[PDB]
Swiss-Prot record:
ZnF endpoints (unnamed): 27-63
Role: Plays a major role in the induction and maintenance of cellular transformation. Acts mainly as an oncoprotein by stimulating the destruction of many host cell key regulatory proteins. E6 associates with host UBE3A/E6-AP ubiquitin-protein ligase, and inactivates tumor suppressors TP53 and TP73 by targeting them to the 26S proteasome for degradation. In turn, DNA damage and chromosomal instabilities increase and lead to cell proliferation and cancer development.
Misc note: Belongs to the high risk human alphapapillomavirus family. The cancer-causing human papillomavirus E6 protein has a unique carboxy terminal PDZ domain containing substrate.
Span(s) of short sequence motif PDZ-binding domain: 73-75
Gene from which this protein is expressed: E6
Species assigned in the record: Human papillomavirus type 16
Top-rank taxon, per record: Viruses
Full protein: residues contained: 87 to 158 of 158
Name of the protein in its database record: Protein E6
Family affiliation: Belongs to the papillomaviridae E6 protein family.
Compartments, record wording: Host cytoplasm; Host nucleus
Subunit structure, interactors included: Forms homodimers. Interacts with ubiquitin-protein ligase UBE3A/E6-AP and thus forms a complex with human TP53. Interacts with human NFX1 and MAGI3. Interacts with human IRF3; this interaction inhibits the establishment of antiviral state. Interacts with human TYK2; this interaction inhibits JAK-STAT activation by interferon alpha. Interacts with host DLG1; this interaction leads to the proteasomal degradation of DLG1.
């Protein structure tokens, strides 16, 4: 279905019926669209992100690691 909430990415393929590989998906701090690479963080390592209508917001590598430095424009 859909609503804003946080979900295990690994399960997102059922969610929208349009998977990560199709869903515009972006970092949460970056708003940078994460590709299958950073999506696989949420799939493989199953990092929990947020689900949004038509897209979402997750954490790219930089952010999934350096979460302590929370900036949206990173400067
Ligand atoms: Zn990021």
């Amino acid at each position: 279905g859909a609503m804003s909430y946080s979900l295990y990415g690994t399960t997102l393929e059922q969610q929208y019926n349009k998977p990560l590989s199709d869903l515009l998906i972006r970092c949460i701090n970056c708003q940078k669209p994460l590709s299958p690479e950073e999506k696989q963080r949420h799939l493989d390592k199953k990092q929990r992100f947020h689900n949004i209508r038509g897209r979402w917001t997750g954490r790219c590598m930089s952010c999934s690691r350096s979460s302590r430095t929370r900036r949206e424009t990173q400067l």
